[PDB]
């Protein structure tokens, strides 16, 4: 694989059960800072700041009418709202130009409104 370039900030992450901290397993947190070495995610449930490796973090799927961010592709670092999704892919609308674009859910990350 060697695909560790799938780390984006402002997106929600899911603690995989493979994480050593079983107390944070299944818990969701927000990514504040990203570092090729490690990732910094804040656990909303733990209300604390902790750093987790992308291998221990899981991407969250954005819901309709929800904000999503391109974590992969040339549009990386781009944000937008999801208007609909295709069982085969995921159609999203760019909140910047309001233009509609189609992207696989694998490249769509769920953002936390908070």
JSON list of N, CA, C and O in Angstrom, two decimals, residues 12-59:
[
{"chain": "A", "resi": 12, "resn": "UNK", "atom": "N", "xyz": [-13.26, 14.53, 10.65]},
{"chain": "A", "resi": 12, "resn": "UNK", "atom": "CA", "xyz": [-13.43, 13.70, 11.87]},
{"chain": "A", "resi": 12, "resn": "UNK", "atom": "C", "xyz": [-12.71, 12.36, 11.68]},
{"chain": "A", "resi": 12, "resn": "UNK", "atom": "O", "xyz": [-12.60, 11.86, 10.58]},
{"chain": "A", "resi": 13, "resn": "UNK", "atom": "N", "xyz": [-12.22, 11.79, 12.75]},
{"chain": "A", "resi": 13, "resn": "UNK", "atom": "CA", "xyz": [-11.50, 10.49, 12.62]},
{"chain": "A", "resi": 13, "resn": "UNK", "atom": "C", "xyz": [-12.13, 9.46, 13.58]},
{"chain": "A", "resi": 13, "resn": "UNK", "atom": "O", "xyz": [-12.61, 9.80, 14.64]},
{"chain": "A", "resi": 14, "resn": "UNK", "atom": "N", "xyz": [-12.12, 8.21, 13.20]},
{"chain": "A", "resi": 14, "resn": "UNK", "atom": "CA", "xyz": [-12.71, 7.17, 14.08]},
{"chain": "A", "resi": 14, "resn": "UNK", "atom": "C", "xyz": [-11.59, 6.31, 14.67]},
{"chain": "A", "resi": 14, "resn": "UNK", "atom": "O", "xyz": [-10.79, 5.74, 13.95]},
{"chain": "A", "resi": 15, "resn": "UNK", "atom": "N", "xyz": [-11.52, 6.22, 15.97]},
{"chain": "A", "resi": 15, "resn": "UNK", "atom": "CA", "xyz": [-10.44, 5.40, 16.60]},
{"chain": "A", "resi": 15, "resn": "UNK", "atom": "C", "xyz": [-10.67, 3.92, 16.29]},
{"chain": "A", "resi": 15, "resn": "UNK", "atom": "O", "xyz": [-11.64, 3.33, 16.72]},
{"chain": "A", "resi": 16, "resn": "UNK", "atom": "N", "xyz": [-9.78, 3.32, 15.55]},
{"chain": "A", "resi": 16, "resn": "UNK", "atom": "CA", "xyz": [-9.95, 1.88, 15.21]},
{"chain": "A", "resi": 16, "resn": "UNK", "atom": "C", "xyz": [-9.76, 1.03, 16.47]},
{"chain": "A", "resi": 16, "resn": "UNK", "atom": "O", "xyz": [-9.00, 1.38, 17.36]},
{"chain": "A", "resi": 17, "resn": "UNK", "atom": "N", "xyz": [-10.44, -0.08, 16.57]},
{"chain": "A", "resi": 17, "resn": "UNK", "atom": "CA", "xyz": [-10.30, -0.94, 17.77]},
{"chain": "A", "resi": 17, "resn": "UNK", "atom": "C", "xyz": [-8.85, -1.42, 17.89]},
{"chain": "A", "resi": 17, "resn": "UNK", "atom": "O", "xyz": [-8.44, -1.95, 18.90]},
{"chain": "A", "resi": 18, "resn": "UNK", "atom": "N", "xyz": [-8.07, -1.25, 16.85]},
{"chain": "A", "resi": 18, "resn": "UNK", "atom": "CA", "xyz": [-6.65, -1.70, 16.91]},
{"chain": "A", "resi": 18, "resn": "UNK", "atom": "C", "xyz": [-5.83, -0.70, 17.74]},
{"chain": "A", "resi": 18, "resn": "UNK", "atom": "O", "xyz": [-4.66, -0.91, 18.00]},
{"chain": "A", "resi": 19, "resn": "UNK", "atom": "N", "xyz": [-6.44, 0.38, 18.15]},
{"chain": "A", "resi": 19, "resn": "UNK", "atom": "CA", "xyz": [-5.69, 1.38, 18.96]},
{"chain": "A", "resi": 19, "resn": "UNK", "atom": "C", "xyz": [-5.38, 0.80, 20.34]},
{"chain": "A", "resi": 19, "resn": "UNK", "atom": "O", "xyz": [-6.17, 0.07, 20.91]},
{"chain": "A", "resi": 20, "resn": "UNK", "atom": "N", "xyz": [-4.24, 1.11, 20.89]},
{"chain": "A", "resi": 20, "resn": "UNK", "atom": "CA", "xyz": [-3.88, 0.57, 22.23]},
{"chain": "A", "resi": 20, "resn": "UNK", "atom": "C", "xyz": [-4.86, 1.11, 23.27]},
{"chain": "A", "resi": 20, "resn": "UNK", "atom": "O", "xyz": [-5.30, 0.39, 24.15]},
{"chain": "A", "resi": 21, "resn": "UNK", "atom": "N", "xyz": [-5.21, 2.36, 23.18]},
{"chain": "A", "resi": 21, "resn": "UNK", "atom": "CA", "xyz": [-6.16, 2.94, 24.17]},
{"chain": "A", "resi": 21, "resn": "UNK", "atom": "C", "xyz": [-7.56, 2.41, 23.90]},
{"chain": "A", "resi": 21, "resn": "UNK", "atom": "O", "xyz": [-8.33, 2.99, 23.16]},
{"chain": "A", "resi": 22, "resn": "UNK", "atom": "N", "xyz": [-7.91, 1.30, 24.50]},
{"chain": "A", "resi": 22, "resn": "UNK", "atom": "CA", "xyz": [-9.27, 0.73, 24.27]},
{"chain": "A", "resi": 22, "resn": "UNK", "atom": "C", "xyz": [-10.33, 1.71, 24.80]},
{"chain": "A", "resi": 22, "resn": "UNK", "atom": "O", "xyz": [-11.49, 1.64, 24.44]},
{"chain": "A", "resi": 23, "resn": "UNK", "atom": "N", "xyz": [-9.94, 2.62, 25.65]},
{"chain": "A", "resi": 23, "resn": "UNK", "atom": "CA", "xyz": [-10.92, 3.60, 26.20]},
{"chain": "A", "resi": 23, "resn": "UNK", "atom": "C", "xyz": [-11.29, 4.60, 25.11]},
{"chain": "A", "resi": 23, "resn": "UNK", "atom": "O", "xyz": [-12.29, 5.29, 25.19]},
{"chain": "A", "resi": 24, "resn": "UNK", "atom": "N", "xyz": [-10.49, 4.70, 24.08]},
{"chain": "A", "resi": 24, "resn": "UNK", "atom": "CA", "xyz": [-10.79, 5.66, 22.99]},
{"chain": "A", "resi": 24, "resn": "UNK", "atom": "C", "xyz": [-11.22, 4.89, 21.74]},
{"chain": "A", "resi": 24, "resn": "UNK", "atom": "O", "xyz": [-11.39, 5.46, 20.67]},
{"chain": "A", "resi": 25, "resn": "UNK", "atom": "N", "xyz": [-11.40, 3.60, 21.86]},
{"chain": "A", "resi": 25, "resn": "UNK", "atom": "CA", "xyz": [-11.81, 2.80, 20.68]},
{"chain": "A", "resi": 25, "resn": "UNK", "atom": "C", "xyz": [-13.28, 3.09, 20.35]},
{"chain": "A", "resi": 25, "resn": "UNK", "atom": "O", "xyz": [-14.12, 3.15, 21.22]},
{"chain": "A", "resi": 26, "resn": "UNK", "atom": "N", "xyz": [-13.59, 3.28, 19.09]},
{"chain": "A", "resi": 26, "resn": "UNK", "atom": "CA", "xyz": [-15.00, 3.57, 18.71]},
{"chain": "A", "resi": 26, "resn": "UNK", "atom": "C", "xyz": [-15.32, 5.03, 19.02]},
{"chain": "A", "resi": 26, "resn": "UNK", "atom": "O", "xyz": [-16.41, 5.50, 18.75]},
{"chain": "A", "resi": 27, "resn": "UNK", "atom": "N", "xyz": [-14.39, 5.75, 19.58]},
{"chain": "A", "resi": 27, "resn": "UNK", "atom": "CA", "xyz": [-14.65, 7.18, 19.91]},
{"chain": "A", "resi": 27, "resn": "UNK", "atom": "C", "xyz": [-14.32, 8.05, 18.69]},
{"chain": "A", "resi": 27, "resn": "UNK", "atom": "O", "xyz": [-13.50, 7.69, 17.87]},
{"chain": "A", "resi": 28, "resn": "UNK", "atom": "N", "xyz": [-14.95, 9.19, 18.57]},
{"chain": "A", "resi": 28, "resn": "UNK", "atom": "CA", "xyz": [-14.67, 10.07, 17.41]},
{"chain": "A", "resi": 28, "resn": "UNK", "atom": "C", "xyz": [-13.93, 11.33, 17.88]},
{"chain": "A", "resi": 28, "resn": "UNK", "atom": "O", "xyz": [-14.14, 11.81, 18.97]},
{"chain": "A", "resi": 29, "resn": "UNK", "atom": "N", "xyz": [-13.08, 11.86, 17.05]},
{"chain": "A", "resi": 29, "resn": "UNK", "atom": "CA", "xyz": [-12.33, 13.09, 17.45]},
{"chain": "A", "resi": 29, "resn": "UNK", "atom": "C", "xyz": [-12.07, 13.95, 16.21]},
{"chain": "A", "resi": 29, "resn": "UNK", "atom": "O", "xyz": [-12.30, 13.53, 15.09]},
{"chain": "A", "resi": 30, "resn": "UNK", "atom": "N", "xyz": [-11.60, 15.15, 16.40]},
{"chain": "A", "resi": 30, "resn": "UNK", "atom": "CA", "xyz": [-11.34, 16.04, 15.23]},
{"chain": "A", "resi": 30, "resn": "UNK", "atom": "C", "xyz": [-9.83, 16.18, 15.03]},
{"chain": "A", "resi": 30, "resn": "UNK", "atom": "O", "xyz": [-9.06, 16.20, 15.97]},
{"chain": "A", "resi": 31, "resn": "UNK", "atom": "N", "xyz": [-9.39, 16.28, 13.80]},
{"chain": "A", "resi": 31, "resn": "UNK", "atom": "CA", "xyz": [-7.93, 16.42, 13.54]},
{"chain": "A", "resi": 31, "resn": "UNK", "atom": "C", "xyz": [-7.56, 17.91, 13.53]},
{"chain": "A", "resi": 31, "resn": "UNK", "atom": "O", "xyz": [-8.00, 18.66, 12.69]},
{"chain": "A", "resi": 32, "resn": "UNK", "atom": "N", "xyz": [-6.75, 18.34, 14.47]},
{"chain": "A", "resi": 32, "resn": "UNK", "atom": "CA", "xyz": [-6.36, 19.77, 14.51]},
{"chain": "A", "resi": 32, "resn": "UNK", "atom": "C", "xyz": [-5.08, 19.98, 13.69]},
{"chain": "A", "resi": 32, "resn": "UNK", "atom": "O", "xyz": [-4.99, 20.87, 12.88]},
{"chain": "A", "resi": 33, "resn": "UNK", "atom": "N", "xyz": [-4.08, 19.16, 13.91]},
{"chain": "A", "resi": 33, "resn": "UNK", "atom": "CA", "xyz": [-2.81, 19.31, 13.15]},
{"chain": "A", "resi": 33, "resn": "UNK", "atom": "C", "xyz": [-2.42, 17.96, 12.54]},
{"chain": "A", "resi": 33, "resn": "UNK", "atom": "O", "xyz": [-2.60, 16.92, 13.14]},
{"chain": "A", "resi": 34, "resn": "UNK", "atom": "N", "xyz": [-1.88, 17.97, 11.35]},
{"chain": "A", "resi": 34, "resn": "UNK", "atom": "CA", "xyz": [-1.47, 16.70, 10.70]},
{"chain": "A", "resi": 34, "resn": "UNK", "atom": "C", "xyz": [0.05, 16.67, 10.54]},
{"chain": "A", "resi": 34, "resn": "UNK", "atom": "O", "xyz": [0.66, 17.65, 10.16]},
{"chain": "A", "resi": 35, "resn": "UNK", "atom": "N", "xyz": [0.67, 15.56, 10.83]},
{"chain": "A", "resi": 35, "resn": "UNK", "atom": "CA", "xyz": [2.15, 15.47, 10.69]},
{"chain": "A", "resi": 35, "resn": "UNK", "atom": "C", "xyz": [2.53, 14.13, 10.06]},
{"chain": "A", "resi": 35, "resn": "UNK", "atom": "O", "xyz": [2.16, 13.08, 10.55]},
{"chain": "A", "resi": 36, "resn": "UNK", "atom": "N", "xyz": [3.25, 14.15, 8.98]},
{"chain": "A", "resi": 36, "resn": "UNK", "atom": "CA", "xyz": [3.65, 12.88, 8.32]},
{"chain": "A", "resi": 36, "resn": "UNK", "atom": "C", "xyz": [4.10, 11.87, 9.38]},
{"chain": "A", "resi": 36, "resn": "UNK", "atom": "O", "xyz": [3.88, 10.68, 9.25]},
{"chain": "A", "resi": 37, "resn": "UNK", "atom": "N", "xyz": [4.71, 12.33, 10.43]},
{"chain": "A", "resi": 37, "resn": "UNK", "atom": "CA", "xyz": [5.16, 11.39, 11.50]},
{"chain": "A", "resi": 37, "resn": "UNK", "atom": "C", "xyz": [3.95, 10.90, 12.29]},
{"chain": "A", "resi": 37, "resn": "UNK", "atom": "O", "xyz": [3.78, 9.71, 12.50]},
{"chain": "A", "resi": 38, "resn": "UNK", "atom": "N", "xyz": [3.11, 11.79, 12.73]},
{"chain": "A", "resi": 38, "resn": "UNK", "atom": "CA", "xyz": [1.91, 11.37, 13.51]},
{"chain": "A", "resi": 38, "resn": "UNK", "atom": "C", "xyz": [0.77, 12.36, 13.25]},
{"chain": "A", "resi": 38, "resn": "UNK", "atom": "O", "xyz": [0.94, 13.35, 12.57]},
{"chain": "A", "resi": 39, "resn": "UNK", "atom": "N", "xyz": [-0.39, 12.10, 13.78]},
{"chain": "A", "resi": 39, "resn": "UNK", "atom": "CA", "xyz": [-1.54, 13.02, 13.56]},
{"chain": "A", "resi": 39, "resn": "UNK", "atom": "C", "xyz": [-2.10, 13.48, 14.91]},
{"chain": "A", "resi": 39, "resn": "UNK", "atom": "O", "xyz": [-2.14, 12.72, 15.86]},
{"chain": "A", "resi": 40, "resn": "UNK", "atom": "N", "xyz": [-2.53, 14.70, 15.00]},
{"chain": "A", "resi": 40, "resn": "UNK", "atom": "CA", "xyz": [-3.09, 15.21, 16.29]},
{"chain": "A", "resi": 40, "resn": "UNK", "atom": "C", "xyz": [-4.62, 15.26, 16.18]},
{"chain": "A", "resi": 40, "resn": "UNK", "atom": "O", "xyz": [-5.17, 16.06, 15.46]},
{"chain": "A", "resi": 41, "resn": "UNK", "atom": "N", "xyz": [-5.30, 14.41, 16.90]},
{"chain": "A", "resi": 41, "resn": "UNK", "atom": "CA", "xyz": [-6.79, 14.42, 16.83]},
{"chain": "A", "resi": 41, "resn": "UNK", "atom": "C", "xyz": [-7.38, 14.69, 18.21]},
{"chain": "A", "resi": 41, "resn": "UNK", "atom": "O", "xyz": [-6.92, 14.17, 19.21]},
{"chain": "A", "resi": 42, "resn": "UNK", "atom": "N", "xyz": [-8.39, 15.51, 18.28]},
{"chain": "A", "resi": 42, "resn": "UNK", "atom": "CA", "xyz": [-9.02, 15.83, 19.59]},
{"chain": "A", "resi": 42, "resn": "UNK", "atom": "C", "xyz": [-10.23, 14.91, 19.79]},
{"chain": "A", "resi": 42, "resn": "UNK", "atom": "O", "xyz": [-11.11, 14.85, 18.95]},
{"chain": "A", "resi": 43, "resn": "UNK", "atom": "N", "xyz": [-10.29, 14.20, 20.88]},
{"chain": "A", "resi": 43, "resn": "UNK", "atom": "CA", "xyz": [-11.45, 13.29, 21.11]},
{"chain": "A", "resi": 43, "resn": "UNK", "atom": "C", "xyz": [-12.62, 14.08, 21.70]},
{"chain": "A", "resi": 43, "resn": "UNK", "atom": "O", "xyz": [-12.55, 14.57, 22.81]},
{"chain": "A", "resi": 44, "resn": "UNK", "atom": "N", "xyz": [-13.69, 14.21, 20.97]},
{"chain": "A", "resi": 44, "resn": "UNK", "atom": "CA", "xyz": [-14.86, 14.97, 21.50]},
{"chain": "A", "resi": 44, "resn": "UNK", "atom": "C", "xyz": [-15.38, 14.30, 22.77]},
{"chain": "A", "resi": 44, "resn": "UNK", "atom": "O", "xyz": [-15.76, 14.95, 23.72]},
{"chain": "A", "resi": 45, "resn": "UNK", "atom": "N", "xyz": [-15.40, 12.99, 22.80]},
{"chain": "A", "resi": 45, "resn": "UNK", "atom": "CA", "xyz": [-15.89, 12.28, 24.01]},
{"chain": "A", "resi": 45, "resn": "UNK", "atom": "C", "xyz": [-14.89, 12.45, 25.15]},
{"chain": "A", "resi": 45, "resn": "UNK", "atom": "O", "xyz": [-15.26, 12.76, 26.27]},
{"chain": "A", "resi": 46, "resn": "UNK", "atom": "N", "xyz": [-13.63, 12.24, 24.89]},
{"chain": "A", "resi": 46, "resn": "UNK", "atom": "CA", "xyz": [-12.61, 12.38, 25.96]},
{"chain": "A", "resi": 46, "resn": "UNK", "atom": "C", "xyz": [-12.38, 13.87, 26.26]},
{"chain": "A", "resi": 46, "resn": "UNK", "atom": "O", "xyz": [-11.80, 14.23, 27.26]},
{"chain": "A", "resi": 47, "resn": "UNK", "atom": "N", "xyz": [-12.83, 14.73, 25.39]},
{"chain": "A", "resi": 47, "resn": "UNK", "atom": "CA", "xyz": [-12.64, 16.19, 25.63]},
{"chain": "A", "resi": 47, "resn": "UNK", "atom": "C", "xyz": [-11.16, 16.47, 25.92]},
{"chain": "A", "resi": 47, "resn": "UNK", "atom": "O", "xyz": [-10.83, 17.34, 26.70]},
{"chain": "A", "resi": 48, "resn": "UNK", "atom": "N", "xyz": [-10.27, 15.74, 25.30]},
{"chain": "A", "resi": 48, "resn": "UNK", "atom": "CA", "xyz": [-8.82, 15.96, 25.55]},
{"chain": "A", "resi": 48, "resn": "UNK", "atom": "C", "xyz": [-8.07, 15.96, 24.21]},
{"chain": "A", "resi": 48, "resn": "UNK", "atom": "O", "xyz": [-8.57, 15.50, 23.21]},
{"chain": "A", "resi": 49, "resn": "UNK", "atom": "N", "xyz": [-6.87, 16.47, 24.20]},
{"chain": "A", "resi": 49, "resn": "UNK", "atom": "CA", "xyz": [-6.09, 16.49, 22.93]},
{"chain": "A", "resi": 49, "resn": "UNK", "atom": "C", "xyz": [-5.11, 15.31, 22.91]},
{"chain": "A", "resi": 49, "resn": "UNK", "atom": "O", "xyz": [-4.33, 15.12, 23.82]},
{"chain": "A", "resi": 50, "resn": "UNK", "atom": "N", "xyz": [-5.15, 14.52, 21.88]},
{"chain": "A", "resi": 50, "resn": "UNK", "atom": "CA", "xyz": [-4.22, 13.35, 21.80]},
{"chain": "A", "resi": 50, "resn": "UNK", "atom": "C", "xyz": [-3.74, 13.17, 20.36]},
{"chain": "A", "resi": 50, "resn": "UNK", "atom": "O", "xyz": [-4.41, 13.55, 19.42]},
{"chain": "A", "resi": 51, "resn": "UNK", "atom": "N", "xyz": [-2.59, 12.59, 20.17]},
{"chain": "A", "resi": 51, "resn": "UNK", "atom": "CA", "xyz": [-2.07, 12.39, 18.79]},
{"chain": "A", "resi": 51, "resn": "UNK", "atom": "C", "xyz": [-2.19, 10.91, 18.42]},
{"chain": "A", "resi": 51, "resn": "UNK", "atom": "O", "xyz": [-1.81, 10.03, 19.17]},
{"chain": "A", "resi": 52, "resn": "UNK", "atom": "N", "xyz": [-2.72, 10.62, 17.26]},
{"chain": "A", "resi": 52, "resn": "UNK", "atom": "CA", "xyz": [-2.87, 9.20, 16.84]},
{"chain": "A", "resi": 52, "resn": "UNK", "atom": "C", "xyz": [-2.28, 9.02, 15.44]},
{"chain": "A", "resi": 52, "resn": "UNK", "atom": "O", "xyz": [-2.34, 9.90, 14.60]},
{"chain": "A", "resi": 53, "resn": "UNK", "atom": "N", "xyz": [-1.71, 7.88, 15.17]},
{"chain": "A", "resi": 53, "resn": "UNK", "atom": "CA", "xyz": [-1.11, 7.64, 13.82]},
{"chain": "A", "resi": 53, "resn": "UNK", "atom": "C", "xyz": [-2.24, 7.36, 12.82]},
{"chain": "A", "resi": 53, "resn": "UNK", "atom": "O", "xyz": [-3.25, 6.78, 13.14]},
{"chain": "A", "resi": 54, "resn": "UNK", "atom": "N", "xyz": [-2.06, 7.79, 11.60]},
{"chain": "A", "resi": 54, "resn": "UNK", "atom": "CA", "xyz": [-3.12, 7.55, 10.57]},
{"chain": "A", "resi": 54, "resn": "UNK", "atom": "C", "xyz": [-3.50, 6.07, 10.56]},
{"chain": "A", "resi": 54, "resn": "UNK", "atom": "O", "xyz": [-4.61, 5.71, 10.22]},
{"chain": "A", "resi": 55, "resn": "UNK", "atom": "N", "xyz": [-2.59, 5.21, 10.92]},
{"chain": "A", "resi": 55, "resn": "UNK", "atom": "CA", "xyz": [-2.90, 3.75, 10.92]},
{"chain": "A", "resi": 55, "resn": "UNK", "atom": "C", "xyz": [-3.89, 3.45, 12.04]},
{"chain": "A", "resi": 55, "resn": "UNK", "atom": "O", "xyz": [-4.58, 2.45, 12.02]},
{"chain": "A", "resi": 56, "resn": "UNK", "atom": "N", "xyz": [-3.97, 4.30, 13.03]},
{"chain": "A", "resi": 56, "resn": "UNK", "atom": "CA", "xyz": [-4.92, 4.06, 14.15]},
{"chain": "A", "resi": 56, "resn": "UNK", "atom": "C", "xyz": [-6.13, 4.98, 14.01]},
{"chain": "A", "resi": 56, "resn": "UNK", "atom": "O", "xyz": [-7.04, 4.96, 14.81]},
{"chain": "A", "resi": 57, "resn": "UNK", "atom": "N", "xyz": [-6.15, 5.80, 12.99]},
{"chain": "A", "resi": 57, "resn": "UNK", "atom": "CA", "xyz": [-7.30, 6.73, 12.80]},
{"chain": "A", "resi": 57, "resn": "UNK", "atom": "C", "xyz": [-8.14, 6.26, 11.61]},
{"chain": "A", "resi": 57, "resn": "UNK", "atom": "O", "xyz": [-7.62, 5.76, 10.63]},
{"chain": "A", "resi": 58, "resn": "UNK", "atom": "N", "xyz": [-9.43, 6.43, 11.68]},
{"chain": "A", "resi": 58, "resn": "UNK", "atom": "CA", "xyz": [-10.30, 6.00, 10.55]},
{"chain": "A", "resi": 58, "resn": "UNK", "atom": "C", "xyz": [-11.11, 7.20, 10.05]},
{"chain": "A", "resi": 58, "resn": "UNK", "atom": "O", "xyz": [-11.56, 8.02, 10.82]},
{"chain": "A", "resi": 59, "resn": "UNK", "atom": "N", "xyz": [-11.28, 7.29, 8.72]},
{"chain": "A", "resi": 59, "resn": "UNK", "atom": "CA", "xyz": [-12.03, 8.39, 8.10]},
{"chain": "A", "resi": 59, "resn": "UNK", "atom": "C", "xyz": [-13.53, 8.29, 8.39]},
{"chain": "A", "resi": 59, "resn": "UNK", "atom": "O", "xyz": [-14.08, 7.21, 8.53]}
]
